[PDB]
Amino acid sequence: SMGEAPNQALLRILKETEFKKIKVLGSGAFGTVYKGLWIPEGEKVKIPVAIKELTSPKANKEILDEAYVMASVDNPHVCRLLGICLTSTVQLIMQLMPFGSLLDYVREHKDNIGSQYLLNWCVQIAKGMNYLEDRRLVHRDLAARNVLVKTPQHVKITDFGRAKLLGKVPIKWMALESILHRIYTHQSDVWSYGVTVWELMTFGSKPYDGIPASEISSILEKGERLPQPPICTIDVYMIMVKCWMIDADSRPKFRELIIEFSKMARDPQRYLVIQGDERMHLPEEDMDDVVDADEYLIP
């Protein structure tokens, strides 16, 4: 093989009759996502799924590139494609993530989220990202909105619509080299990881809230960064600031971020100061044959 190794991932094609749409979970620019059940025929098994749609030939091109990428990933902190359905609109059949986006989760449970959870989410995102780096894959769109929540203890990265091998763009999560020069490395995803961590530690604040995106390039060139969240010690903020260095190679590698955040995760109250940290706790069908996608494996 002249460069990359051959990608022997199986694209599984699912019948429309195998799965039942239940309700609409979300709708927007990204598309239409539905809650559903997948019942693979023969097997006494029911699999909670999210079904993503979007109509146009350019749109089928974009979602099949996303399907390509999700089909080729297998890590506990990255979402995989279960299959595709080839109806009039191409559907992506994915794992149901019951607690939704991590951005929406931190906003809704601001009063119940402890330091242990926040730091473990940072570990898990770093592991997910390091895996994508091992697969030579630049996400190009890491943010709290694109991290989903399987359980409060277990998050995964998704939205591979911008994912590429090493009009509208998410300026406020992007490294300076990406805004100025369209340069995207694993180290530009590290910048976005920093902003993602900032979202989590502020319980889902909008980064640069009020600033228009055309002004952001000059702001970052001047040396301005996102402010230190109230709960963050200097230890945690220094790691965020390190992700936002001008020099890309000077930023942390994802493997180092796993290490540092997991050290901090063993003594969470030393690194995040939250009022009342200790008392905080977190969590129609025949459910007998229900199996989560992580337990439904294929030969």
In angstroms, give the least distance from the CB of 5 to ligand W7W: 25
Nearer to ligand W7W, 36 or 229 (CB): 36
Question: E-assigned strands of the chain?
Answer: 19-27, 32-38, 47-53, 81-86, 90-95, 137-138, 147-151, 154-157, 164-165
The span from the CA of 150 to the CA of 148, in Å, is 7
Q: Which two tokens stand for residue 243?
A: 């992700």
Q: Is 84 in the site for ligand W7W (CB under 6 A)?
A: no
Residue nearest to Cl ion (CB): 72
Binding-site partner at residue 195 among Cl ion, ligand W7W, none, CB < 5 to 8 Å by type: none
Binding-site partner at residue 72 among Cl ion, ligand W7W, none, CB < 5 to 8 Å by type: Cl ion
Residues in region 58-77 near Cl ion by CB under 5 A = 72
Among 14, 47, 50, 71, binds ligand W7W (CB under 6 A): 50
The span from the CA of 264 to the CA of 32, in Å, is 38
Q: Is 146 in the site for ligand W7W (CB under 6 A)?
A: yes
**In terms of residues, how long is the chain?**
299
Report the greatest alpha carbon distance in the chain: 62
- Count other Cβ atoms within 10 Å, centred on residue 90: 19
In angstroms, give the least distance from the CB of 130 to Cl ion: 15
DSSP single-letter state for residue 124: H
Nearer to ligand W7W, 76 or 268 (CB): 76
Tell the residue number behind the tokens 């009039």, with chain if given.
Answer: 88
| Binding-site size, Cl ion (CB under 5 A) | 1
Catalytic (active-site) positions: 141
CA distances (Å), 226 to each of 58, 91, 104, 197, 201, in order? Answer: 36, 38, 20, 11, 12
The span from the CA of 155 to the CA of 236, in Å, is 20
Site string (90-129) toward ligand W7W, x via CB under 6 A: ----xxxxx-xx----------------------------
In angstroms, give the least distance from the CB of 187 to Cl ion: 19
Q: Is 144 in the site for ligand W7W (CB under 6 A)?
A: no
Tell the residue number behind the tokens 């942390």, with chain if given.
Answer: 252
Piece of the chain touching ligand W7W by CB under 6 A; list 30-38, 125-133, 265-273, 280-288: 30-38
**Coil, helix or strand at residue 96:** coil
What would the DSSP string read from start to end of 182-248?
----HHHHHHHHHHHHHHHHTTSPPTTTT--HHHHHHHHHHT--PPPPTTB-HHHHHHHHHHT-SSS
Piece of the chain touching ligand W7W by CB under 6 A; list 145-153, 167-175, 186-194, 246-254: 145-153
Piece of the chain touching ligand W7W by CB under 6 A; list 7-15, 29-37, 197-205, 278-286: 29-37
Piece of the chain touching ligand W7W by CB under 6 A; list 7-15, 28-36, 57-65, 223-231: 28-36
Q: Which two tokens stand for residue 68?
A: 């390509």
Q: Residues in the site for ligand W7W, rule: CB under 6 A?
A: 25-26, 30, 33, 35, 50, 52, 79, 94-98, 100-101, 145-146, 148, 158-159
Q: Residues in the site for Cl ion, rule: CB under 5 A?
A: 72
